[PDB]
Amino acid sequence: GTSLDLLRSLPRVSLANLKPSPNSRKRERRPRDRRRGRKCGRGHKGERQRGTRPRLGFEGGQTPFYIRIPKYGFNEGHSFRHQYQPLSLRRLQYLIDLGRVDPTQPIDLTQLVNGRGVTIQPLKRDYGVQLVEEGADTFQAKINIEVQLASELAIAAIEKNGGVVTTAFYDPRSLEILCKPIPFFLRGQPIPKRMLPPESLVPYYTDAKNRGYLADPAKFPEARLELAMKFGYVLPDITKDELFRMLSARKDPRQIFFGLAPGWVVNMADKKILKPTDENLLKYYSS
Amino acid sequence: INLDGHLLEPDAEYVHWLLTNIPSNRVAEGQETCPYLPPFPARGSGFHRFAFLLFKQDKPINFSEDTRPSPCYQLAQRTFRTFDFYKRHQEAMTPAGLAFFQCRWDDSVTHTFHQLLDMREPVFEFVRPPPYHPKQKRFPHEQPLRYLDRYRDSHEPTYGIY
Amino acid sequence: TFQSIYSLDKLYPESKGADTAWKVPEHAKQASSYIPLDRLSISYCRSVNSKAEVRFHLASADWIEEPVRQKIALTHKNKINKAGELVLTSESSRYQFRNLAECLQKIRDMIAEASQVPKEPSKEDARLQRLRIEKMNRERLRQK
Amino acid sequence: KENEAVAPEFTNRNPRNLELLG
Amino acid sequence: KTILVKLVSQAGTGFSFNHKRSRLREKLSLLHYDPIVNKKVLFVEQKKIRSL
Amino acid sequence: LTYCSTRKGKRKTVKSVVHRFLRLHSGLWLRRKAGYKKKLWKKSTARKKRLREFVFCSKTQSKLLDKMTTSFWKRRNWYAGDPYQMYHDRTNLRV
RNA sequence: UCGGAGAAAAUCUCCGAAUGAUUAUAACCUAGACUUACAAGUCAAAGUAAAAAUAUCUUGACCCAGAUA
Ligand SMILES: [Mg+2]
Ligand SMILES: [Mg+2]
Ligand SMILES: [Mg+2]
Ligand SMILES: [Mg+2]
């Protein structure tokens, strides 16, 4: 460019020629000159001038504002409430379009996080992803996806195209392994089991209408049909579809990863998977 | 005349039918400048007022410029304004009689719009102005939680970048 | 494939088939007043809410039984176009999926209310009183 | 069709229109 | 002089509201709107809350 | 207020704010009305209705509460079925 | 501490309230405003619900303890 041609003429760049970007630094003012010296910006003698004014929120001796308001449980149990990151079909379509979420294979929270499509924070009480209806009208992809929460309209968009959506619960410990699997294989521990939902969440994940992972499989076809009629689309028979096996693939309710059983150890250095043989240890994991 | 009508033009009034040169009481002898159209008040447009007015005819005048092609089903042509018409013939026309009724919409109106008017019937609804709200503030001090609902457009959640 | 005591096969022994959930229900396009989607023509006009229009010819349509058709035409004449098609629309959401849903649902209600006789007249709303009172005056004057 | 032309806003002039509507 | 009483609905609901009576006047009873029942029902005095 | 803590070197939240006010992500704060549970027998019906409401805070009050709480209380929280889901953003605000 | 009257709104001149009895039992919800440092305090269309519209006349925060459901 023309800028580089200017460098050719100009003298060498060196440590003696450096300069910061203009206005990059403000100048700090010492209390030395008459303008900023003398009383030094503090005012005439007094409590605020000696530096001993009362604490923040003190109002000179009347009951402060933040003390005379009734105490109310807006934030009770905030640290215990569950948080589900929202994923919109617009974001899902956009990720697929640019190749960042491969639709050929099943989509699980690992793949979504692995494609920088969602950011999961188990420390801040993230327990998964909830599918968001936004973008349903323009959603034209056939995919198999597992999400901890889903909405009635969000499910309809996935299924109408012939995809599969199932809702699966991951416990706080399992989610952290799911989100960052490799920073776990490096520890050297065996893969833990996946714990069942708490009593409060059991109804949601055992219900077909929500596509629960613990729900009765025989009851799905009725649920799929009713949703199709309500939203005015024809339910597509996915058994005929060539990639039916991939669409129907589902991990065991006590399994975190698709091809890895609980209890195995992943020797990444040697590209091996140590597996136990003991009976009590195999009964513990297979339970 | 219907006074209030002419969907397109506000200051207008259709002529349902004009008999001219009516000699004496008898009316069958009048020149049928315009055939009879059935009332066609649009749905949800309120009470249209129709009036029957009679002028005293001094001398026989041919109203050729006022004659209409019979049958006239090109509603657009029925556009008419008395003042201009009366002014033309004010010398020989002086009103002497009145009779007016007001009518709402009815199923026959749908028949008129379709069968002979040969167009889709218009539907009108009474629309009020939106309620007044003072300009929204960043900090609605001392206002209840309902304040934020007053200024929202969509009743459904949005998720933006998520 | 790894299996555990909580695998779906063990939890639900009867439905052990691989394709049990992914089959399509046999029949079920006849019961529950199934609406044939093919017959209806659905158009989306983006009015912000995406308006949805479901238009079909009431009389020609055969999926609706003839007795219902006559009742629907009389009761809902205002929604019938000059072509004879029944035009119903909704503009209550930003999602066409939802918009179409009420359109389809409204059809179902029409059939039911036309299928089921509404014997109850209910209480007379003030609008009905105004209509009745003004109607009565017409007869008195019309007595000529 | 020239017949189909309709103004977006109606201008019902009948003085007793709104009163009769209530 | 007067007392604060608790009139309790006799419609079988637990709805109650507080009223004032004169220590001399007999025990109170009134017809009042019960939101749970959405009807007017008798409220009869059951307990005193304080002496006001 | 504790500006620099002995152990962690950070500011500290004033847990009297956390137990009285709700902060919407847009920047607003909700509170109750003082006295809404007191002497209800001698308060007028209109007065009681005003007391029951959730109310907003002024600009200076919000500025104070922002000083008294840490960043963790200002993050965006994705609660399933949240009853304040729609009140965390401002719409049609030109000002 | 607050309210009523005069000076006439700065300090002065006077009376009262920390309620009282009556009662139709006086709901929920929600535009726009008054007042106001904050806090507290006023008025209220529309809609719905009860009934067959009406409450008439003249005041103490937070915390913390209670009571019943
Ligand atoms: Mg310095
Ligand atoms: Mg996050
Ligand atoms: Mg205030
Ligand atoms: Mg009212």
Tab-separated table of N, CA and C (backbone and C1' of nucleotides) in Angstrom, chain F residues 20 31-36 38-39 42-43 45 47 49-52 61, chain G residues 19 26-30 38-44 59-63:
chain	number	residue	atom	x	y	z
F	20	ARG	N	-33.197	-6.981	50.159
F	20	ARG	CA	-34.273	-6.006	50.066
F	20	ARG	C	-34.632	-5.609	48.646
F	31	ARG	N	-38.194	-2.665	44.634
F	31	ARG	CA	-38.294	-2.718	46.084
F	31	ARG	C	-39.758	-2.834	46.481
F	32	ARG	N	-39.980	-3.079	47.768
F	32	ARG	CA	-41.308	-3.005	48.350
F	32	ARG	C	-41.521	-1.621	48.953
F	33	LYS	N	-42.704	-1.404	49.515
F	33	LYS	CA	-43.051	-0.145	50.156
F	33	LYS	C	-43.025	-0.335	51.664
F	34	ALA	N	-42.321	0.555	52.356
F	34	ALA	CA	-42.185	0.438	53.800
F	34	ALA	C	-43.545	0.550	54.471
F	35	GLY	N	-43.836	-0.395	55.359
F	35	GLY	CA	-45.085	-0.397	56.084
F	35	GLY	C	-46.198	-1.203	55.458
F	36	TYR	N	-45.913	-2.001	54.428
F	36	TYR	CA	-46.988	-2.704	53.739
F	36	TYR	C	-47.538	-3.876	54.543
F	38	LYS	N	-47.890	-3.479	58.074
F	38	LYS	CA	-48.030	-2.864	59.386
F	38	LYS	C	-49.394	-2.205	59.513
F	39	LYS	N	-50.105	-2.530	60.592
F	39	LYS	CA	-51.329	-1.829	60.980
F	39	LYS	C	-52.303	-1.726	59.809
F	42	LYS	N	-56.092	-0.138	60.068
F	42	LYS	CA	-56.408	1.285	60.062
F	42	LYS	C	-55.997	1.977	58.771
F	43	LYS	N	-55.580	1.223	57.758
F	43	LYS	CA	-55.200	1.782	56.469
F	43	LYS	C	-56.357	1.650	55.490
F	45	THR	N	-58.380	1.142	51.931
F	45	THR	CA	-58.238	0.094	50.928
F	45	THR	C	-57.349	0.551	49.779
F	47	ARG	N	-54.951	2.794	50.049
F	47	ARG	CA	-53.598	2.848	50.592
F	47	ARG	C	-52.949	1.472	50.587
F	49	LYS	N	-53.564	-1.042	48.616
F	49	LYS	CA	-53.238	-1.450	47.253
F	49	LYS	C	-51.921	-0.836	46.798
F	50	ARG	N	-51.699	0.440	47.117
F	50	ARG	CA	-50.440	1.081	46.758
F	50	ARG	C	-49.265	0.384	47.430
F	51	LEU	N	-49.459	-0.066	48.670
F	51	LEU	CA	-48.371	-0.665	49.434
F	51	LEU	C	-47.947	-2.012	48.856
F	52	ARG	N	-48.901	-2.799	48.353
F	52	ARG	CA	-48.605	-4.149	47.883
F	52	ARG	C	-47.742	-4.186	46.630
F	61	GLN	N	-30.635	6.494	43.900
F	61	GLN	CA	-30.742	5.284	44.707
F	61	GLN	C	-30.128	4.094	43.986
G	19	U	P	-54.927	6.058	68.967
G	19	U	O5'	-56.175	6.726	68.238
G	19	U	C5'	-57.467	6.137	68.302
G	19	U	C4'	-58.475	7.111	68.860
G	19	U	C3'	-59.939	6.697	68.774
G	19	U	O3'	-60.346	5.855	69.840
G	19	U	C1'	-59.701	8.876	67.916
G	26	A	P	-68.294	-5.117	51.052
G	26	A	O5'	-67.193	-4.136	50.450
G	26	A	C5'	-67.478	-3.303	49.330
G	26	A	C4'	-66.619	-2.061	49.317
G	26	A	C3'	-65.392	-2.104	50.222
G	26	A	O3'	-64.327	-1.313	49.680
G	26	A	C1'	-66.851	-0.394	50.956
G	27	A	P	-63.498	-1.766	48.371
G	27	A	O5'	-62.785	-3.138	48.763
G	27	A	C5'	-63.544	-4.314	49.009
G	27	A	C4'	-63.002	-5.517	48.280
G	27	A	C3'	-61.819	-5.281	47.349
G	27	A	O3'	-60.567	-5.283	48.013
G	27	A	C1'	-63.481	-6.445	46.178
G	28	C	P	-59.269	-4.669	47.290
G	28	C	O5'	-59.096	-5.555	45.979
G	28	C	C5'	-58.517	-6.848	46.041
G	28	C	C4'	-58.704	-7.599	44.748
G	28	C	C3'	-57.755	-7.222	43.625
G	28	C	O3'	-56.493	-7.851	43.733
G	28	C	C1'	-59.962	-7.282	42.794
G	29	C	P	-55.253	-7.279	42.895
G	29	C	O5'	-55.713	-7.476	41.386
G	29	C	C5'	-54.887	-7.054	40.319
G	29	C	C4'	-55.689	-6.445	39.200
G	29	C	C3'	-55.060	-5.247	38.519
G	29	C	O3'	-54.049	-5.614	37.603
G	29	C	C1'	-57.348	-4.819	38.925
G	30	U	P	-52.662	-4.812	37.581
G	30	U	O5'	-53.014	-3.504	36.747
G	30	U	C5'	-53.531	-3.614	35.431
G	30	U	C4'	-54.219	-2.348	34.998
G	30	U	C3'	-53.371	-1.093	35.018
G	30	U	O3'	-52.513	-0.989	33.900
G	30	U	C1'	-55.473	-0.640	35.992
G	38	C	P	-37.961	12.835	46.620
G	38	C	O5'	-37.176	11.807	47.542
G	38	C	C5'	-36.127	11.002	47.029
G	38	C	C4'	-35.554	10.125	48.108
G	38	C	C3'	-36.541	9.186	48.779
G	38	C	O3'	-36.766	8.002	48.036
G	38	C	C1'	-35.313	10.326	50.432
G	39	A	P	-38.256	7.453	47.818
G	39	A	O5'	-38.754	7.107	49.289
G	39	A	C5'	-38.083	6.139	50.081
G	39	A	C4'	-38.517	6.204	51.524
G	39	A	C3'	-40.014	6.144	51.773
G	39	A	O3'	-40.534	4.830	51.729
G	39	A	C1'	-39.097	7.912	53.020
G	40	A	P	-41.877	4.525	50.906
G	40	A	O5'	-43.022	5.252	51.737
G	40	A	C5'	-43.536	4.684	52.930
G	40	A	C4'	-44.190	5.729	53.798
G	40	A	C3'	-45.565	6.204	53.354
G	40	A	O3'	-46.609	5.329	53.744
G	40	A	C1'	-44.222	8.075	53.816
G	41	G	P	-47.930	5.189	52.843
G	41	G	O5'	-48.474	6.679	52.725
G	41	G	C5'	-48.936	7.380	53.869
G	41	G	C4'	-49.324	8.795	53.531
G	41	G	C3'	-50.528	8.949	52.623
G	41	G	O3'	-51.746	8.837	53.337
G	41	G	C1'	-48.783	10.369	51.885
G	42	U	P	-53.060	8.238	52.636
G	42	U	O5'	-53.660	9.477	51.848
G	42	U	C5'	-53.940	9.371	50.467
G	42	U	C4'	-54.236	10.711	49.851
G	42	U	C3'	-55.183	10.664	48.658
G	42	U	O3'	-56.545	10.741	49.038
G	42	U	C1'	-53.205	11.749	48.019
G	43	C	P	-57.553	9.551	48.655
G	43	C	O5'	-58.097	9.968	47.219
G	43	C	C5'	-58.519	11.298	46.969
G	43	C	C4'	-58.549	11.607	45.494
G	43	C	C3'	-59.133	10.537	44.592
G	43	C	O3'	-60.548	10.499	44.612
G	43	C	C1'	-57.152	11.391	43.631
G	44	A	P	-61.314	9.108	44.369
G	44	A	O5'	-60.991	8.762	42.850
G	44	A	C5'	-61.403	9.628	41.805
G	44	A	C4'	-60.780	9.238	40.489
G	44	A	C3'	-61.054	7.822	40.015
G	44	A	O3'	-62.322	7.679	39.404
G	44	A	C1'	-58.755	8.262	39.828
G	59	U	P	-52.681	10.706	59.401
G	59	U	O5'	-52.572	9.121	59.537
G	59	U	C5'	-51.312	8.471	59.634
G	59	U	C4'	-50.640	8.750	60.957
G	59	U	C3'	-50.104	7.534	61.701
G	59	U	O3'	-48.809	7.154	61.272
G	59	U	C1'	-51.404	8.845	63.177
G	60	G	P	-48.548	5.707	60.623
G	60	G	O5'	-46.971	5.662	60.424
G	60	G	C5'	-46.112	6.465	61.227
G	60	G	C4'	-44.960	5.667	61.781
G	60	G	C3'	-45.302	4.242	62.224
G	60	G	O3'	-44.209	3.375	61.925
G	60	G	C1'	-44.396	5.436	64.039
G	61	A	P	-44.463	1.826	61.583
G	61	A	O5'	-43.341	1.493	60.507
G	61	A	C5'	-43.371	2.087	59.219
G	61	A	C4'	-41.980	2.292	58.678
G	61	A	C3'	-41.047	1.099	58.784
G	61	A	O3'	-41.224	0.165	57.734
G	61	A	C1'	-39.952	3.010	59.611
G	62	C	P	-41.492	-1.385	58.057
G	62	C	O5'	-40.032	-1.997	58.187
G	62	C	C5'	-39.056	-1.767	57.185
G	62	C	C4'	-37.662	-1.903	57.736
G	62	C	C3'	-37.381	-3.157	58.543
G	62	C	O3'	-37.151	-4.300	57.740
G	62	C	C1'	-36.528	-1.285	59.689
G	63	C	P	-37.794	-5.715	58.146
G	63	C	O5'	-36.832	-6.261	59.288
G	63	C	C5'	-35.429	-6.322	59.096
G	63	C	C4'	-34.690	-6.271	60.410
G	63	C	C3'	-35.042	-7.349	61.419
G	63	C	O3'	-34.400	-8.584	61.159
G	63	C	C1'	-35.018	-5.254	62.495
